[PDB]
Design a protein around this ligand. Structure first.
Ligand SMILES: [Cu+2]
Ligand SMILES: [Cu+2]
Lengths: 117, 115
């Protein structure tokens, strides 16, 4: 319970998600207070939001002109940009990118919501 | 209010000297998040330390050859994108040069550092 854990994000089996591929660590079973994903943005995705989870993206690399959209506002991605996304904030990434997604509390896939067209 | 998104370039934050090197700390206590994110450059030897009220997760972005992390007296090698969860009271430090992202929970408190 109070034991350190060690995981290689790059070696974790990658799973498909709407925006690309996710390598997820420290889920709810792990006892940690947050999940840590190493996520490859390869494809465009619906704008979405979370009702119970706040996310913090940390950009590790990105394609030129890649942006992030927060409540309909667009901002360019740069290296080591950190973005805090509280619950209810509509968000998505546009263009290719690699990020560390820090989720609290631990990530729960059930908590994904969309606005209709 | 912590209802609003926030945005900060870790590489542009004023670097603060800490025992192990230099830290660029974002989303501190006041930011209204549940965690702090530090972009920390480990450049020097540091005494083995521990935290009494804080979980830490290191994510190694880069490291010099043969660099290690020590946890409760055990040495393991560092590798790129190695993630280490360090619960409260786990004695630990990094030996050798490295660049990490340090995720702290609850938000960072500089008072909480022990020996
Ligand atoms: Cu999200
Ligand atoms: Cu520490």
């Amino acid at each position: 319970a109070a034991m350190p854990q060690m995981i290689s994000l790059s070696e974790i089996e990658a799973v498909a998600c709407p925006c690309g591929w996710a390598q997820r660590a420290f889920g709810h079973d792990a006892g940690t207070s947050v999940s840590v994903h190493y996520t490859q943005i390869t494809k465009a995705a619906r704008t979405h939001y979370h009702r119970e989870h706040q996310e913090i993206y940390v950009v590790l690399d990105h394609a030129a002109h890649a942006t992030i959209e927060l409540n309909g506002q667009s901002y360019p991605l740069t290296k080591l940009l950190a973005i805090s996304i509280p619950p209810l904030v509509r968000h998505r990434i546009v263009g290719e990118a690699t990020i560390i997604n820090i989720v609290s509390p631990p990530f729960d896939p059930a908590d994904e919501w969309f606005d209709s067209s």
